[PDB]
Amino acid sequence: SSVTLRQLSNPYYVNTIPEEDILKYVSYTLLATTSALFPFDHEQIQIPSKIPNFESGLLHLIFEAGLLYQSLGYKVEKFRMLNISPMKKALIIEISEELQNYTAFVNNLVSSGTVVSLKSLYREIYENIIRLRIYCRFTEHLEELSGDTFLIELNIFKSHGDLTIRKIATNLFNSMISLYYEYLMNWLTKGLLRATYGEFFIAENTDTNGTDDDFIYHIPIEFNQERVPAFIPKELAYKIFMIGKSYIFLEKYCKEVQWTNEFSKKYHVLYQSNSYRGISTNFFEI
């Protein structure tokens, strides 16, 4: 009886597809690309007949990846045509790089031909399943809210006990805090409020009560206590607000052009030299 048990079992199951062609079709669809057995209607999958419950469940488990790929693709295509905050496109570009890396990994798997059965494909990509899953969950409300919300959320997540979440959150957080570092530099070196779109805690006030409170008796720059992210101590926030107001007060009326400009260039160099530390004690020292 030196015969093969799966050979003893396969012709018993007469009306099913050779598992080799199942692999053939799953490799195409893994990137949510329609073909003979699975025509994505851009929103779901129709799994046909002659497919045992086992195969159906495994196709659920695997095709999670393709569904995520399509959803994230819709997100990316939907926002690349819009006018939004720069941190938003920071998220867009990072998600796009993730999508490209997933593409490369999947097609490299297909090329090298280490796929032999469904469960092999399962184990090969389960990590990338989780990566795509986390990337999806982090941007559930990209359309409505502002970026600094995401800055705070990601700052909280930086200490997540998961190593994978550690790495992902740290990368996203690093990129946006570099851009936000640019915002802080702009405020501390020129005192402007350009192109912040409400993601910055120091606001400008164009108001009609006291029409002359931008002429003589007031300076229309306002510190909103509740809008400071948790990685900045409150007292240093007061310091920063007073620094900007100081610069405005000197430039607009005091006319300390030479002193303010030399001071500005010196400190401009001083912060721009330390951008690779982000937010840290050295920056607080300056």
Binding site: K50, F54, S56, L61, E64, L67, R123, I156, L163
Partner: protein
């Protein structure tokens, strides 16, 4: 072989606000156990005794399936299971009509699968922020044990043998399961999970200066879920309960070393700089500011590694608190956020092997070496500066 004309379709899930961070977002497959499709065959047609090998061959397929957490053709889910329920229990019927060789040993493996499911769900349930970091870091570990030890060994090896070996035997199935000793490891994780659930249910059940001159008071409050001190206590208790299994000891030691890396970083950093950074509120004590002159400190007894009932553990805890406060005031007075290493002779290291340090006979040695460092620098501060 038949067709039941069932609209089996795959699509992501609509709701997002109740499924945890790592929770799966795909719809559940269509419920063969009550909505059958494409075959309902009773092996009584082929229940002939000579067909026994043939029968188990079919059986083999289904069993090689369930271990990945997906039910097999000749296995029905019990009426209790509901996929939309995240907390539904796990139980499911297999037909007694076949030879016992089908049913007897299978119960062992399906339990694996049962626990394989719960761990996975635990792998998700503990992903939430409020559960603190330790279990959260622990989450990572459980995932690895599946995708690098359970699957890459068992699934790969079992499928290869079932496709190549002439009439691979279920007896050899057991032999290769235990020859890689995975079952015992998985059982250790299982029982640790059961104790964690026990502590959670206990906390969900019952909701209701003299000598040392420390300006301190207790803050005894209970939270619904256990934290790091509880977890570490638990691992110590389990390793104590299973002294002797060398593989078990080594596995648990690796676990303890792996989970508390940055926890040890936090403790060491506090003992050598008096700086406490616990964005999850898991550390042993916590500060005020819920001006910074009456820096009153409180004990959250619920996370301490010891009952703190006798004199010696109280002594250890109080030396801990004093050492932290001393270094803190040093930093406050000298207007420097960091203590340079070379300020003194007594040099200290990190807890590179927390496993043995937890046992005793070295914990206090580390504690009082740091105490000596604190005293010498502090006294030099108020005697020379």
């Amino acid at each position: 072989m038949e067709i039941k004309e069932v609209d089996d379709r795959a699509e992501l899930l609509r709701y997002t606000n109740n499924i945890p961070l790592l929770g799966k977002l795909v719809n559940h497959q269509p419920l063969w156990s009550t909505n059958p499709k494409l075959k309902s065959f009773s092996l009584e047609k082929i229940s002939a005794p000579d067909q026994r090998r043939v029968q188990e061959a079919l059986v083999v397929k289904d069993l090689l399936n369930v271990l990945i957490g997906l039910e097999g053709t000749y296995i029905r889910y019990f009426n209790d299971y509901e996929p939309s329920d995240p907390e539904t229990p796990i139980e499911f019927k297999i037909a007694k009509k076949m030879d016992p060789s089908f049913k007897t040993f299978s119960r062992r493996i399906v339990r694996y699968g049962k626990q394989y499911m719960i761990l996975t769900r635990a792998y998700e349930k503990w992903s939430d922020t409020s559960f603190g970091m330790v279990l959260q870091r622990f989450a990572y570990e459980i995932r690895r044990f599946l995708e690098d030890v359970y699957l890459k060994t068992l699934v790969e090896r079992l499928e290869r043998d079932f496709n190549k070996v002439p009439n691979f035997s279920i007896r050899e199935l057991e032999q290769i399961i235990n020859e890689t000793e995975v079952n015992k490891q998985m059982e250790l994780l299982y029982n640790i999970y059961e104790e964690i659930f026990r502590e959670i249910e206990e906390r969900r059940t019952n909701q209701s200066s003299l000598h040392l001159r420390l300006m301190v008071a207790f803050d005894t409050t209970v939270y619904p879920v256990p934290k790091g001190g509880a977890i570490l206590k638990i691992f110590q208790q389990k390793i104590l309960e299973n002294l002797g299994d060398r593989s078990s000891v080594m596995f648990l030691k690796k676990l303890l070393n792996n989970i508390s890396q940055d926890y040890c970083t936090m403790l060491y950093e506090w003992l050598t700089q008096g700086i406490l950074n616990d964005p999850y509120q898991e550390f042993m004590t916590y500060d005020d500011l819920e001006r910074a002159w009456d820096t009153q400190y409180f004990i959250r007894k619920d996370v301490l590694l010891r009952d703190c009932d006798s004199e010696e553990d109280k002594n250890l805890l109080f030396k801990m608190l004093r050492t932290g406060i001393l270094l803190k005031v040093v930093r406050a007075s000298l207007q420097i956020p960091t203590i340079p290493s070379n300020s003194s002779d007594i040099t200290i290291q990190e807890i590179n092997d927390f496993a043995d340090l937890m046992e005793g006979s070295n914990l206090e040695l580390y504690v009082d070496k740091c105490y000596s460092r604190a005293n010498e620098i502090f006294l030099k501060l108020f005697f020379q500066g």
